[PDB]
Write a protein that binds this ligand. Structure first.
Ligand SMILES: Cc1cc2nc3c(=O)[nH]c(=O)nc-3n(C[C@H](O)[C@H](O)[C@H](O)COP(=O)(O)O)c2cc1C
Ligand SMILES: Cc1cc2nc3c(=O)[nH]c(=O)nc-3n(C[C@H](O)[C@H](O)[C@H](O)COP(=O)(O)O)c2cc1C
Ligand SMILES: Cc1cc2nc3c(=O)[nH]c(=O)nc-3n(C[C@H](O)[C@H](O)[C@H](O)COP(=O)(O)O)c2cc1C
Lengths: 193, 193, 193
């Protein structure tokens, strides 16, 4: 199987506006598939149709509507509560890589705290050490400079083994989404073996 | 007063399906009363009528409907927000024992974190050292193997003095509900003095 | 500019009933303005009209209705999600002082945990060290005596530099609201320079 599978977790940062650009780039990438997990807050910054528009844009398709979304569904907490398979378990099995872009201060704090009362955090909590995780913090600079940020980055890094694509240095802006994609393709390369 | 009073806290684990069997067993037990606190997630795995059906089953009653629930009401967060007495305070006073079965990873993390934005966690936070607590973790094995699980079990055990009926060793399955009940009856025995 | 600006954060403690008395006192105070941030739980203990009634009472105004609220709006989480300015950022810039009165055990735990999934906690997380913070814990005495309370007060104090107007010694009752106001006026004095 020559397919690399990425789960993109988007959280309640303004940088979630670039989530459709990332998905569009991953779709167009030949041997990479992408599934998206959106926290409730992140859904305020983009819609499913933004993603669909973004996929068509990247694939040089004319406008129109679907439907099956090419097929890249944006999963939310609601989907999980509707012997049957459990969604965050299915996503854990599927994923070869988990990318949190953007990662808000809240999600960072929740991850460091081990709290898992959403699809996104249940997925991360359920992961096996098989699956690598890339965290891209994205927040107001005064949120990033907060004392608890570095303590949570520490927990997330040393304890959990997550990789931090730390924000651009007013430090706090997310790593540019194009850089995110090429980081992802670098892992796809590793995986192809 | 020869009555032993148990508050059962059920959380969002699949093992919550066995919560009605526990309640049915505690009701039938001669000198034990039970009250139930359900987190919102746990209410997805069983209903009030499951409990009622389970009580009738244990008490050899024919089917029918109530009403007063024998009277074992499943308390939820909603009830608490409807000089008046505060529910989680009333439950703390009432309880001789608090049993968390099942305890999800989320609830474990919330307890260890001291977060109390629900009936269940407000009750635990408000307890006096008079009242013992039994925690029965129940989660996907990769959630239990997560690094933060053991750190939270440590906080819950050493700091809070909670007793952990640790999961069955794929470690993560809840202690069998029949074992839970007999653990409970062992405390009832202690209490009878 | 001879105006001192206070943001009052009210949380889900019964002491939130005195929040309108505080606002009324701050409004009447000549060189002090007040804005209010209410957690969802705190909105159960008082309404906007309680505040308005309380302002009229303090300003010797006859009853009637508004409208513009004099103008002291009680901000909630809902307002924040309705290039545009972000509310908790605007409030951070505005505030010369942040007062958490009352501070529940939950909010204390969330602050210590760095969790910021509400207007109140996003505001606190986004603050600059320029702005001082006064925390007034207010909870059931058994919640205050809980082991995690002192650990959170420690984090909040040493790590974050927040000032704790610790509860009255059954320790747990909030510092009397009149004492809160005069503490606030003491900071206004400092600020006037
Ligand atoms: C308009 C707006 C923009 C926000 N931008 C950010 C941000 O860039 N980074 C961040 O950490 N939080 C930001 N927040 C705060 C989070 O959205 C808020 O804490 C949210 O509840 C976190 O939810 P989450 O854990 O799903 O990300 C913003 C909030 C609003 C209302
Ligand atoms: C179908 C389904 C089954 C789940 N089973 C478990 C479980 O067995 N153990 C666990 O820790 N979490 C489990 N979860 C995740 C929790 O339900 C989720 O984290 C929830 O928000 C926790 O809420 P709580 O703190 O009230 O338990 C499950 C989720 C779903 C959707
Ligand atoms: C009637 C009632 C009164 C409460 N009083 C207090 C209190 O005085 N102090 C406290 O810490 N929690 C109290 N609680 C519990 C909190 O309201 C609950 O934990 C809430 O979810 C916390 O939300 P918050 O973080 O916005 O304050 C009370 C709850 C109820 C239902």
């Amino acid at each position: 199987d020559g397919i690399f599978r990425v789960v993109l977790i988007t959280s309640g940062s303004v940088a979630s506006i670039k989530a459709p650009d990332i998905v569009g780039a991953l779709v167009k990438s030949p041997n990479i598939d992408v599934q998206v997990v959106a926290t409730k807050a992140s859904t305020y910054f983009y819609s499913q149709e933004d993603v669909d528009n973004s996929v068509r844009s990247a694939l040089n398709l004319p406008d129109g509507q679907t439907g099956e979304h090419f097929g890249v569904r944006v999963w939310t907490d609601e989907d999980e509560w509707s012997g049957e398979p459990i969604l965050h378990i299915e996503l854990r099995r599927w994923a070869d890589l988990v990318v949190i872009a953007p990662c808000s201060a809240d999600l960072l704090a929740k991850i460091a705290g081990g709290i898992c009362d959403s699809l996104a955090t249940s997925l991360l909590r359920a992961l096996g050490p098989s699956t690598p995780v890339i965290v891209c913090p994205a927040m107001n600079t005064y949120m990033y400079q907060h004392r608890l940020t570095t303590r949570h980055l520490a927990v997330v890094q040393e304890d959990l083994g997550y990789l931090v694509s730390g924000p651009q240095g007013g430090p706090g802006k997310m790593t540019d989404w194009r850089d995110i994609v090429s980081l992802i393709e670098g892992f796809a390369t590793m995986h192809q073996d």
